[model samples]
Target chain A: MKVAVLPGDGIGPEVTEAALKVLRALDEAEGLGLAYEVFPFGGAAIDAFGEPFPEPTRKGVEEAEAVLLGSVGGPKWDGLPRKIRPETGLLSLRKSQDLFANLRPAKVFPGLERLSPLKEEIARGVDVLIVRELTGGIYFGEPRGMSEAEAWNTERYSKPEVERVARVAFEAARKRRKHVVSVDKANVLEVGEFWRKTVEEVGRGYPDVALEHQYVDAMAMHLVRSPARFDVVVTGNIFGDILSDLASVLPGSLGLLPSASLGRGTPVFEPVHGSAPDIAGKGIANPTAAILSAAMMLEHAFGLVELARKVEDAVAKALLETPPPDLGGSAGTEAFTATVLRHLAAA
Target chain B: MKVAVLPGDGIGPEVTEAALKVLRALDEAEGLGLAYEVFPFGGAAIDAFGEPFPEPTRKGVEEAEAVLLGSVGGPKWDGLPRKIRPETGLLSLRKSQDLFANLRPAKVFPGLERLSPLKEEIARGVDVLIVRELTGGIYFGEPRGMSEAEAWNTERYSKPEVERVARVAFEAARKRRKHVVSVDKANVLEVGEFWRKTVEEVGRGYPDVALEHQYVDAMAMHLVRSPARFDVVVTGNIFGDILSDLASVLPGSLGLLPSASLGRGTPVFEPVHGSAPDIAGKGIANPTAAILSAAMMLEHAFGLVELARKVEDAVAKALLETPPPDLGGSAGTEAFTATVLRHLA
Candidate 1:
């Protein structure tokens, strides 16, 4: 499989390098035949080709079966025009590929429960997958405007817009826990009821999977009160934006969460953490989230479930055996990557 | 001062009765002229009269300076017509008074920090007041509808609507911690920008109080990650609905929280907990929230700040002295009220 790697900026290059090493180890051991090509994107692309998402990178991504992204944007690109900025490049890339469903998996890894803000018992064994609709809903809804006297925004969602995302959630749920909690505010908003009805209809197709619905407000409380009770949670754009960010803090460290954006074409996998421009040159940046993102690409893009699990297990063992500085251990990025590689060989 | 007491349904009467006992004690001790009239509302009104918010109760409420509500709605009233439901009565009561700002105060009382969902260190000394714009925004916004093809709702807010709620938050902060955090989605939604700007404009009026703007998403994360860092939070209707409910669970027991709805006319003070039907008539329901709501009525409605603190302090002492069953103590309604009254005396 051809993979397009955009190791964008700051700690992006270091972490993506770590992830690539693990992927190479897996490819050799499992005979996966994974070939990847690096492309300049984000701030680096702007420097090299005077555009964030250059033509060469766009063509490279279009030809690849899967895409691995390092975090983007930095102070260097902050002053650029909005359309040509590093963040805009990411938006344009997702728009180009039509990646509508964003999956963020938050789990409290063993031995790291103390890092969580929640009580240890509440934070322990919390594994939740939040599938958020990316393209539609209030953020991009039409007829939105601001004025001196008043302002208004429309939260509109069509049946097809809701159906496609619901299918993504159900398909994802079938692989893990056979339960999906569709979160909405059906009692108040019309779009919420529409979204709920469409999800219920789509859920009927998957007879083996159980489906439930919760209001966004109640779900917000439950996420804090009993986060362990949720498995797969699906919601629209705005609610997901708030909820996914809220859940991101549950596992204590943003450096350990991985995300995937799937659509009709190529899937893009990335770490949920942002590029740490302040710690760019420092070798202390955590690479676990990037490595986990590679594992997601292996399972979702290449149909290598066993190899993916192997990679994930190796990363977990590496976390315990050679804890990263972010997790309060002394190991650097290279050392942590070497430990994961050693684990893969031993396995 | 005439206070209209609507001890609505289920444990509503019992808890309100406890609150009234505490208030009467305060009236006798402070020589405050306090008189009240009982009005039937909610499920009880539907049982006695034909409607939930009957004509007689409306007249009684209009004549009062302040209103104290126990709670409304239960399974028995669930099957009633939508407009005649017990919950509908509370809505009509708020609407009649144009009560647009809702205040829910969540505090982790001393000696009860273990009940909080948060860690002890995190939950300790956590006091936050969430000011919600109750009557406007998307819930009551026009141009809202659902069709087979698409559904849409307008999150519209005028300048005046934002100004009044912002002022309420600032006024609340002036009496508490002198800081207000106005939450919005200004990064994306236009209405958010308008709300933030209007709040910023209003915040300038209260030069002594500090004001900060936070995106709703970031604020949601901060509420859990570092709850103690907040003093007073103000937001629009929908955002407030989600945030206030989220904050209410922080102190662990909903039965210990109090809320106030302020508007142009008579303000309403009520417990944040619902009319818990299963625990009703069992005498195990906690009356602390109702007692605290009465304290809020004293501070906000009557501007009796010192007596309100006395009531609040006494309730906190009672919680530790003769703990309620909800807090793992065996004290029932009468016993808990007795402890509070004893502390009051």
Candidate 2:
């Protein structure tokens, strides 16, 4: 499999290096015949080619079967125009790839329940997967305008838009808990009712999986009141944007969450945390999220399910043995990755 | 002062009776010359007059200086038509009174921190006043339509709509912690930017209060991560609907929370909890929220600030002395009220 690696900026290169080393070790052990090429993107690309997502890097990403992204954006690019910013480059890349579904998995690893903001009993054993529709709904809806006196925005979603995202949620659910809670505000919003009906229709294909519905407001309360009750939570763009970010803090550390964006073209996997420019040169940045993103790429992009689980388990076991500085331990990024590598080899 | 009382359904009458007792006792002691009239509304009105918000009750409520609602709705009214349902009656009442701003205060009372879903340290000293813009925003926005293939809704906010709600928040902050966190989705939605700008304009009128802008998503996270850090949070209709409900659960027991809806005319005070049909008539329903709602009416509607604090403190003191069944103690409806009355005296 050919993987396009965009080690973007800040601590991005460091975490990407840690993940690559783990992937290479796995590849050597299993003889998986993996090949990868590095491409400049985000702020680094802007400095080198004067454009964040330049022509050459775009072509390289298009040719590759999969994409692994490190964190993007920094204070250095804060002065640039909105269209040329590192974050905008990422948005353009997603648009080019037609990536519509965003998968963010938040799990509280054992022995780390104390770090959660919620009570230990409530935070313990909380494993939730939030599948958010990326391309449609209010974020990109039509008839939105602002004026001096008044402003308005439209929240619109069509059948095809809801169906494709619903399918992604159901397919993802079949592999895990086989339960999906479709969140919407059907009682109030017309778009919410339409989205709910479409999801129910798409859910008919999966007879084995159980489907339930909850309002976005009620789901927000439930996420805090009892997070472990949820399995796979699916919602539209705006609600998901709020909900996924809200759920990201439940597990206490953003440094441990991984995300995947999937659609028509190549799937892109990345850490949910942002680029830490202050910790760029310091070896204390946590690499668990990046390594786990690699595991997601192996499962979703490369069909290496066992290898993905192996990588995930190794990371979890290594966390118990050699805790990272972010989780209040002394191990640096390289040392943590080395522990994960040792666990991978031992297994 | 004349107060219209609507003890709507199920546990509504029970809790309303408890709140009225406390109010009468306070009025007697303070010599405030308080007078109240009971009007049928919600399920009771539907059964008595064939309409949830009957003509006579509406006239009575409009003539009163303030309105006190116990609770509304039940499974019996759930099967009714959308317009005639008990819940719809409450909506109509709000529209008639022009109640545009809803206030929901969630506070972790002393000795009750253990009941919270959050850690003790996190839940301690947590007091959040969520001022919600009720009558406008997407819930009542025009150009909303639903089709077979797709659907759309408009989130529109005019200058005046945002200004009035901002004033409610600032005035509220002036009375409390003097810090207002105005929440919006300004990063994406254009309406959010308009809302933020209008709020800042109104906030300047009250220079003593501090105002801060936060994205709705980030506020949702902060509410859970460090709920104690906030004082007054104000937002639009839909955001408020979601956020207020989320914050209501923070103090663990909905029975201890109270809400007030204020606007151009008579204000309405009510317990945040519902009718709670299953516990109705059993005498086990908690009455603290209703008593606190009466306290809000005393302070907001009649400008009886010290009397309101006396009622609030009495209820808080009563809770520690005689615990309610909902909080794992055996005090019933009348028993709890009697305990509060004793504390009041």
Candidate 3:
């Protein structure tokens, strides 16, 4: 399998190195020799070519079957314009790749549900996947600007946008709990009503899947009160942005999350946590999310479910035994990766 | 002082009765001389007069200093048109009364922080006020519709709308923690940027109040992770609609939340929990919110700080001694009101 590796900035390189070490270990153990093409991206790419995602970097990712990205953005790129910033590079990359679906899966691994902000019982059985439509909705709505006295933005959603996103969620539901809660502000906003209608229509194609509609505000409260009630939550861009972050903290630390942005072609895997510039040179950055991101790449992009399961189980064992500094263990990034590798080797 | 009491529907009358009992107790104990004019509103009013906020009810409230509303709306009015529904009556009342600012105050009472889903220590110091702009923003924005291809709604906020709401937040800060965090999505939404700028400009007038800004998405996380970090949060109608409800449940039960919508005319105070049609006339409805709303009315509308303090303390004492069923206590509505009355007397 050919993979494009882009370790952007700050703790990004530190975490990606751990992931790479584990990826190499998997290859050595299973004889799955993965080819990697590294490229400059985010702040480093901006520095090298005055563009966060230059044409060369684009070409590098184009030829790979999958892409693994470390966290991006830092204070170094804070002064840049909105279009040229490190974060913009991520958005631009997703847009150029036509990555319309963002899948963020969160679960409370046993013994670690205590880290959740919610009560132990409430967080225990919570295993939810947030399937978000990344390419449409209010965030990218047109006719948005401010006048001297008033400012306005349109929250527009067409039929196709809602249909395609709903299809992604329903397809994912087929593999999970066969339940999809399509969240929208249907009672008030027209866009929400349209979204609800479109999702219900697509749900007809999946007879086994159970579908429910919840208002976004109600969904927010329900998430904190009873997170286990949901299996898969589908929504538009802005609501999903808020909800995915809200769900990210369910298992306590942001370090435990891995995300995938899926397009028609190669998908990009990355950690949900941003670059911790404050801990850049500390060498204690947790590689749990990065490694799990590699697991996601294996499962989602490479069609190697057994390989993905091995990587996932190893990380879970590593987390329970020798945890990283992010989860209060003394293990550095290298030590944590070694622990995960040991687990993989033992298996 | 004369009060217009609108016990709209379902658990509405039951809870308001508990609040009314307390008001009458205050009048008897301390010559408060409070007068109450009961009016039918919401679904009941629509059934009575072909309108939710009828002319007689409007006249009833027009003659009073403040209005006390219990929960409104029920499945009984589910088939009604959007304009004449029970919930629309509440909106009609707010708009007609020019209620631009909504104050939703949430506090985890002592010995009850454990009720919160969050850890005890995190939920302990959660004494914050959410001052939401009730009348403006996307909920009521024009040019909204659903077509064959697309559906859309505009998120618009004007200078006056932001200024008045900001002033409400600053005033609330002066009474509470003297800190205000204006939440918006300024990075992406133009209305949010304009809201942020307008709030900053309004903030300059209040030297005593400390003001800061946060995006709506981050605010949602912070409200759960570290609620003690905030003192007062002010946002537009739609954001507030979401955030206020989010903040209301922080104390675990929606039964204990009280809200006040402020405007140029008579301010209406009500419990945060809506009409629970499921338990409407069961006499098991929780009265904590309704009773606290009366306390708010006394303090905010009538300027009876000591009197409001008395009502508030009595309820707190009652809760400690005997809680409502919603709060793990077995006290029925009559029993809870009796407990509050026992404390009040």
**Which stretch of 10 consecutive residues in model 2 chain A shows the poorest summed lDDT?**
A299-308
Give TM-score values for chain A, per-prediction.
0.97, 0.97, 0.93
| C-alpha lDDT score of every prediction, in listed order | 0.90, 0.90, 0.86
Model 1's DockQ score = 0.88
Candidate 3 CAPRI category: medium
Off by over 4 Å in 1: none
Instruction: Give one digit per residue, the lDDT tens place, for model 1 in A9-109.
Output: 99988999999999888777767778889999999999989889999899999999999999998888899888898878999899899999999988887
Best by DockQ: 1
Q: On residues A258-336, what C-alpha lDDT tens digit does candidate 2 reach at each position?
A: 9999999888999988899998979989899999999989987887877888998899888889999888799999999
* Number of backbone clashes in candidate 3: 0
Model 3 per-residue lDDT tens digits across residues B1-345:
889999999899999998998888888888877988899999889999888999899888878889999988888898879879887888788887899998988888877877998878778878788998987878888778998799998888889999988988887787667899999999888888899999999988998999889888888888888888789999988778778878877888777888898898889999988888889888898898999999989977887877777787788788888888878789888888788887775
Task: Report, in order, each candidate's fnat.
Answer: 0.92, 0.88, 0.81
CAPRI band of model 2? Answer: high
Candidate 2 ranges with C-alpha deviation above 4 Å:
none
Model 3 Cα interface RMS deviation (Å): 1.0
In model 1, what lDDT does residue B167 have? Answer: 89
Rank order by TM-score, top first?
1, 2, 3
